[PDB]
Amino acid sequence: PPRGKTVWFTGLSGSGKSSVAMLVERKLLEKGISAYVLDGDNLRHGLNADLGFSMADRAENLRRLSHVATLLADCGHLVLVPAISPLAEHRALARKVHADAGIDFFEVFCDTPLQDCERRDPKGLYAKARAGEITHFTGIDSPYQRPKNPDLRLTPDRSIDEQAQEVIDLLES
Ligand SMILES: Nc1ncnc2c1ncn2[C@@H]1O[C@H](COP(=O)(O)OP(=O)(O)NP(=O)(O)O)[C@@H](O)[C@H]1O
Ligand SMILES: Nc1ncnc2c1ncn2[C@@H]1O[C@H](COP(=O)(O)OS(=O)(=O)O)[C@@H](O)[C@H]1O
Ligand SMILES: [Mg+2]
């Protein structure tokens, strides 16, 4: 089986990473293309349950995810990784792990403004952060460094279904 590839999705909480990743996975599977989603939040309940949201713990979370992604890619899967990845150094590290493993790596920036993410607020975390009930929350009191040159920038200009089709177009180009 030919080696797979990784699509790494960075962005604020509530920017649409997980939604887009899951729809891409569905669209690919339906077409007989093996895809799998390694979602930062879901994996923080198992593999990464020992980690919090300190910058050191986020780096570790993302290091681990990058190695798990290369291994599933080596197996032939198209791997989708929705994780905030707030620091440039976090994306650089993931990119390096992939380079070292000889797996193609695509960076997708879900560029939804903070105001819109907050206006969405699907898990109530922004409201908690602003009330001081959660600390070190990305975009509020923990940094997000915007990617300078992502392979694809998704904006809230179209449906999730269309955004998923743009990721597929990127892969198929
Ligand atoms: N293109 C879009 N059009 C309309 N709504 C959208 C779009 N993209 C995302 N959303 C909405 O934004 C909400 C947050 O999406 P989600 O995919 O959970 O974000 P995330 O980046 O994975 N968040 P987090 O897990 O906190 O890092 C979803 O409930 C979507 O309904
Ligand atoms: N302090 C926090 N900062 C950011 N996201 C948080 C925080 N606490 C809980 N979360 C939730 O945890 C998930 C972010 O986890 P990751 O994507 O794994 O983060 S990362 O920074 O290490 O890349 C999101 O689904 C988010 O809703
Ligand atoms: Mg998510």
Residue numbers in the entry: 440 to 612
How did the manuscript describe this experimental structure?
The CysN polypeptide also contains a C-terminal APS (adenosine-5’-phosphosulfate) kinase domain (CysC), which exists as a separate enzyme in other bacteria and plants. Alternatively, APS can be phosphorylated at the 3′-position by APS kinase (CysC) to generate 3′-phosphoadenosine 5′-phosphosulfate (PAPS), a substrate for sulfotransferases that catalyze the transfer of the sulfate group onto a variety of metabolites. The structure of CysC is characterized by the canonical α/β-purine nucleotide binding fold, consisting of a five-stranded parallel β-sheet which is flanked on both sides by two α-helices. Structural features typical of APS kinases of this fold family, including the P-loop required for ATP binding (residues 452–458 in CysC), the conserved LDGD motif (residues 477–480) and the lid region (residues 552–581) above the P-loop which closes upon substrate binding, are also found in CysC.
